[PDB]
Amino acid sequence: AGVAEFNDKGELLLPKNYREWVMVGTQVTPTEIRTVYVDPESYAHWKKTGEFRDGTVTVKELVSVGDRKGPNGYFMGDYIGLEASVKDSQRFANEPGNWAFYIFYVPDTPLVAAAKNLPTAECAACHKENAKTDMVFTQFYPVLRAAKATGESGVVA
Amino acid sequence: AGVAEFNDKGELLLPKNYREWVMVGTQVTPTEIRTVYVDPESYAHWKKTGEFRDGTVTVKELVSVGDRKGPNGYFMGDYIGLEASVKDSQRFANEPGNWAFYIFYVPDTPLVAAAKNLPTAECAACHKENAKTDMVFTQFYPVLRAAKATGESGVVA
Numbered sequence: 001a002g003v004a005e006f007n008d009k010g011e012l013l014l015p016k017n018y019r020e021w022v023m024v025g026t027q028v029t030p031t032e033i034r035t036v037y038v039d040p041e042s043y044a045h046w047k048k049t050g051e052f053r054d055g056t057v058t059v060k061e062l063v064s065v066g067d068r069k070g071p072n073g074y075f076m077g078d079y080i081g082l083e084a085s086v087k088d089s090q091r092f093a094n095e096p097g098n099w100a101f102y103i104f105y106v107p108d109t110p111l112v113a114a115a116k117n118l119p120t121a122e123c124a125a126c127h128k129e130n131a132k133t134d135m136v137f138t139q140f141y142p143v144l145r146a147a148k149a150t151g152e153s154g155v156v157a
Numbered sequence: 158a159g160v161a162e163f164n165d166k167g168e169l170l171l172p173k174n175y176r177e178w179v180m181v182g183t184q185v186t187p188t189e190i191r192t193v194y195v196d197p198e199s200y201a202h203w204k205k206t207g208e209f210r211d212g213t214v215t216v217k218e219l220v221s222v223g224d225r226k227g228p229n230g231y232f233m234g235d236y237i238g239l240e241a242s243v244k245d246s247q248r249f250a251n252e253p254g255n256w257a258f259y260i261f262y263v264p265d266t267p268l269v270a271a272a273k274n275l276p277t278a279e280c281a282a283c284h285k286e287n288a289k290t291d292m293v294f295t296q297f298y299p300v301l302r303a304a305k306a307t308g309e310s311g312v313v314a
């Protein structure tokens with residue numbers, strides 16, 4: 001059933017300590033950096049199978065960009081947004097791929113402790129139309145690639 | 158003593174599964190993305206104390222940049238390099254801050270299974286001269302900031 005926690009009305013509670021999950025890719029929009037996490041048990045399953053288990057949770061964390069000069073570059077600035085997706089064949093039996101999509105906050109919609117699953121036109125449509133693997137954009141996540149192709153979570157000599 | 162493993166001649170062995178460690182910041186050079194990891198036990202200590210324990214290992218992983226068009230952005234491409242640093246008051250009693258610095262590979266120096274600690278002019282000098290906190294560039298690592306300032310590894314409502 002996985003790591004997702006839901007309140008009585010079925011809203012997804014803010015995942016806890018997700019920055020300790022496995023970071024699978026980071027993207028930059030030319031302004032924003034996005035960091036993508038997969039919960040450790042789902043990542044472990046992925047290593048073994050190249051599949052997203054029932055109960056998989058992903059988190060996408062949005063940051064502004066800081067500028068470094070010397071001793072030049074960009075770095076993760078302020079946290080400005082948080083999205084998540086959850087796979088559950090039972091709870092989301094009627095959603096495409098059994099995935100539900102969520103916004104916790106973005107440039108201003110204020111932060112909620114619990115989020116309602118979003119309509120397919122808003123989120124799932126793009127994902128199911130374009131994502132390489134089961135509605136997750138693994139074409140952009142080299143941590144997952146090395147994990148699936150070789151069972152590894154790092155370079156090996 | 159921490160997670161670092163050394164061979165008989167005192168060379169640091171390639172850390173294993175470091176992409177499962179805690180990613181503390183990602184940087185972009187305007188061409189390359191760099192991802193920075195802190196081993197989970199040292200991260201846990203940091204959460205509690207705002208200090209790098211004896212035995213702390215950090216890893217900096219270097220990637221080329223892929224280009225995404227639709228459905229525009231940049232993403233982590235090919236792995237092209239790996240550096241590490243290790244704090245040990247006993248093993249590195251004679252190094253600045255007791256930190257040793259290492260290159261496993263970069264655009265071509267080929268990959269080694271084990272790396273020798275590098276001279277201070279090459280690595281430690283810049284770090285000890287410019288890094289905010291104990292020779293680690295925490296001024297650029299917002300995961301560590303939120304962890305130290307609030308004990309949190311994620312946004313809380």
Ligand code: HEC
Pocket residue numbers: 027028034036058059060083084085101102103118122123124126127131135136137138140227228230
């Ligand atoms: C990244 C994303 C993630 C990370 C996990 C994954 O499925 O890859 C989540 C949980 C999420 N988004 Fe999503 N999205 C798109 C692309 C190309 C990427 C990876 C590349 C990058 O980050 O730069 C995503 C694409 C799209 C998209 C195309 C027009 C739409 C309309 C959406 N995404 C919409 C949503 C959501 C609705 C608010 C939502 C909660 C998402 N995405 C979650």
Ligand code: HEC
Pocket residue numbers: 070071073184185191193215216217240241242258259260275279280281283284288292293294295297
């Ligand atoms: C990042 C780095 C890390 C990550 C941990 C940390 O100490 O912050 C390691 C293990 C490492 N480098 Fe390092 N370095 C510099 C800066 C500003 C950052 C963070 C910003 C970013 O990644 O864009 C670093 C600075 C410098 C520098 C200034 C001229 C020098 C000469 C070096 N660094 C040299 C080295 C190493 C010698 C080959 C080496 C093994 C490093 N750094 C490791």
